[PDB]
Amino acid sequence: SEEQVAQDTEEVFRSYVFYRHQQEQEAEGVAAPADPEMVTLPLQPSSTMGQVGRLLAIIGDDINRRYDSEFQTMLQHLQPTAENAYEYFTKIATSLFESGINWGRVVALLGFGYRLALHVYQHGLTGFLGQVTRFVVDFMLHHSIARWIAQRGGWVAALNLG
């Protein structure tokens, strides 16, 4: 079901963010970017969607690198407002899927959402992580990504990538 995949994306993305942030803390120690909002967000580690988001953060660690690097350098130029965040999110997310959908691109979108959320927090926009989550959920619903995931077996199919 496309709609149920779309509903599950919130928990997948929240779990992805938590574990990606924890992994960056483990890799960088005191040099990691601080964002307490990514430590305290709602989390259910044993749920299926919590397990999916975590596994995608893990497998993403050795595939995101070039795309993750350019996200950071580009975000240094992101203007401060919620409208600027939406416009930049939409441009980048659309470009990721211009040539079709695949799991690597899904993971790239989650990673982009993580980097966007981190950037806006570091530049003084607090309480915006739920809004980035909604950007991701709604984009995946209206851009047929939830439909593509549903035809692959749902988010649980992502566990096969590990």
Q: Are 64 and 107 in contact (CB under 8 A)?
A: yes
Euclidean distance between CA atoms 114 and 126, whole angstroms = 14
Supply the minimum distance, in Å, between the C-beta of residue 46 and Zn ion.
28
Euclidean distance between CA atoms 156 and 32, whole angstroms = 30
Residue 142 annotated as lining a ligand binding site: yes
77 binds, among Zn ion, a copy of itself, none (CB under 5 to 8 A by kind): Zn ion
Burial label for 137, CB within 10 Å (0-12, 13-18, 19+), is buried
Using rule CB under 8 A, residue 10 touches a copy of itself: no
Give residues 29-88 in contact with a copy of itself (rule: CB under 8 A). Answer: 80-84, 86
| Tokens encoding 75 | 């975000």
Is the Cβ of residue 52 or residue 125 nearer to a copy of itself in the bound state?
125
Instruction: Tell me the number of residues near a copy of itself by CB under 8 A.
Output: 15
Q: Are 114 and 20 in contact (CB under 8 A)?
A: yes
Give residues 123-142 in contact with a copy of itself (rule: CB under 8 A). Answer: 125-131, 134, 138
Binding site for Zn ion (CB under 5 A): 24, 77, 138
- Binding region for Zn(2+): 138, 142
